[PDB]
Amino acid sequence: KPVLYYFNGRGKMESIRWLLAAAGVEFEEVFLETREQYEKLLQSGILMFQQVPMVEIDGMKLVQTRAILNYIAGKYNLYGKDLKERALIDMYVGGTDDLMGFLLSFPFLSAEDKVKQCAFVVEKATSRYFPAYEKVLKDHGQDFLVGNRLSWADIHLLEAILMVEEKKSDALSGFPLLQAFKKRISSIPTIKKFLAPGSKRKPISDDKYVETVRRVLRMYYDVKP
Amino acid sequence: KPVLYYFNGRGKMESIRWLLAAAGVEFEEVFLETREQYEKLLQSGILMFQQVPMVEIDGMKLVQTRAILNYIAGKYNLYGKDLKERALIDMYVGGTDDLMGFLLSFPFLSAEDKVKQCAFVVEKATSRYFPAYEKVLKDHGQDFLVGNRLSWADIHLLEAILMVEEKKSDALSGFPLLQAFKKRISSIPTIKKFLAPGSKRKPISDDKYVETVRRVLRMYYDVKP
Ligand SMILES: N[C@@H](CCC(=O)N[C@@H](CSc1ccc([N+](=O)[O-])cc1[N+](=O)[O-])C(=O)NCC(=O)O)C(=O)O
Numbered sequence: 126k127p128v129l130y131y132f133n134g135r136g137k138m139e140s141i142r143w144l145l146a147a148a149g150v151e152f153e154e155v156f157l158e159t160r161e162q163y164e165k166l167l168q169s170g171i172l173m174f175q176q177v178p179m180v181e182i183d184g185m186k187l188v189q190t191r192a193i194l195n196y197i198a199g200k201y202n203l204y205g206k207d208l209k210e211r212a213l214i215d216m217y218v219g220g221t222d223d224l225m226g227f228l229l230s231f232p233f234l235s236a237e238d239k240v241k242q243c244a245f246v247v248e249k250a251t252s253r254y255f256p257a258y259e260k261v262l263k264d265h266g267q268d269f270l271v272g273n274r275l276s277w278a279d280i281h282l283l284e285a286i287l288m289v290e291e292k293k294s295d296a297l298s299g300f301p302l303l304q305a306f307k308k309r310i311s312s313i314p315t316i317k318k319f320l321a322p323g324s325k326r327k328p329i330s331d332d333k334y335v336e337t338v339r340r341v342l343r344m345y346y347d348v349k350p
Numbered sequence: 351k352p353v354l355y356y357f358n359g360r361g362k363m364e365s366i367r368w369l370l371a372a373a374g375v376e377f378e379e380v381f382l383e384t385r386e387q388y389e390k391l392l393q394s395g396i397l398m399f400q401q402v403p404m405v406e407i408d409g410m411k412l413v414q415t416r417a418i419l420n421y422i423a424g425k426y427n428l429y430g431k432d433l434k435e436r437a438l439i440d441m442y443v444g445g446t447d448d449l450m451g452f453l454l455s456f457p458f459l460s461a462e463d464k465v466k467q468c469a470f471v472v473e474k475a476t477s478r479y480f481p482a483y484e485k486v487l488k489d490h491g492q493d494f495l496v497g498n499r500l501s502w503a504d505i506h507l508l509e510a511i512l513m514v515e516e517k518k519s520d521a522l523s524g525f526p527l528l529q530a531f532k533k534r535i536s537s538i539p540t541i542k543k544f545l546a547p548g549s550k551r552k553p554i555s556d557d558k559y560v561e562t563v564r565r566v567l568r569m570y571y572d573v574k575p
Pocket residue numbers: 135136137138175176177178188189190191229230231233342345348444448
């Protein structure tokens with residue numbers, strides 16, 4: 126059973142939690158709460174680059190979020206059928222990875238910049254990413270982004286859709302296909318379960334999360350928008 | 351055949367030029383010298399997310415640097431031989447990607463910020479990245495990072511090493527295996543050629559470059575370290 130080393134919040138580990146749940150894969154979590162728990166980890170040398178996320182899976186101590194997702198997508202057949210499909214999946218994931226990235230430092234921002242950051246994110250979504258994914262689905266008319274079947278690109282897009290809707294409830298208005306897309310993917314048994322209450326899915330990160338990360342890593346004390 | 355659309359400089363495209371070159375793949379380049387070219391590109395809509403780099407290859411208009419690199423590594427067998435090896439390659443690439451990432455804005459940085467960033471990068475190279483790779487090479491004693499054969503990870507690490515040494519010629523001091531690694535990988539025919547004069551390899555980005563980028567995209571004027 127894979128073990129996820131990160132803090133007790135979303136951050137970069139959330140997308141990992143999603144993919145594993147989507148693959149219907151049971152997993153354990155290890156949360157960093159104290160600076161000494163971390164330093165103890167550095168001492169063991171299990172974090173190749175001194176960072177987290179880190180995931181022990183199949184005898185590996187994988188670090189680097191994209192390497193972790195890539196491996197999981199591949200291991201569970203959520204990475205397409207050939208190089209071409211994977212290329213499309215990677216191009217799509219890169220988009221949502223950028224979009225979600227804009228919300229990763231939100232909890233570390235100040236009320237002042239949070240207001241600005243929210244504006245920036247939503248705008249990027251309605252003017253850049255939603256149009257792009259809405260277009261893919263339209264010109265393809267299929268039920269999924271790639272290969273007419275559930276793939277990691279679909280799962281990454283849904284998570285990003287929901288993160289934006291958490292900021293602007295009506296952000297999907299004007300994107301009928303994406304709306305239908307949301308219903309389909311959200312009803313997949315595994316994803317449906319991950320969305321139901323009581324899952325390991327994490328809520329939006331808050332001060333407690335931020336504060337913990339700062340004590341543990343001694344950084345990001347002044348994250349800029 | 352493949353056509354790389356980007357500015358006439360390094361930026362995020364340099365890594366792509368590196369991999370293609372190492373794989374023995376000739377390519378064309380289209381530079382953006384005017385705010386016009388861009389606005390015209392947006393019209394055609396060949397930029398899924400309105401961004402560059404973008405590469406036309408095998409009938410695709412691929413955007414998102416990593417998706418492009420991933421595809422190229424896969425197509426020309428520089429991505430290992432199984433999901434496990436791919437994971438290690440993606441993990442290594444993650445590190446060099448962050449390391450080179452820290453230099454990607456360097457040219458846009460102020461006179462003083464550059465000296466701040468310079469030390470930062472060097473700090474990361476000697477205290478975080480170089481050690482990690484030195485350790486990998488030491489643990490299995492092979493000439494290549496993974497699968498005892500040239501991989502994308504070897505190519506990315508070599509580019510990263512040079513970018514660092516361009517800022518500090520003695521950055522590899524204390525990393526003998528990496529020093530031996532530098533010579534070995536550089537000796538490989540395709541790479542030796544890419545490193546020889548007259549190749550499509552880009553020099554350190556100058557003020558001219560920064561100005562052009564700022565023009566074509568009307569962004570990146572206040573880039574912080
Ligand atoms: N490229 C690596 C980057 C990993 C990384 O930056 N890890 C951070 C924690 S995550 C993180 C750290 C800061 C913020 N932030 O918003 O300030 C958001 C997140 N996040 O995961 O969303 C870390 O361990 N830092 C310690 C160090 O570098 O010394 C990856 O994708 O996995």
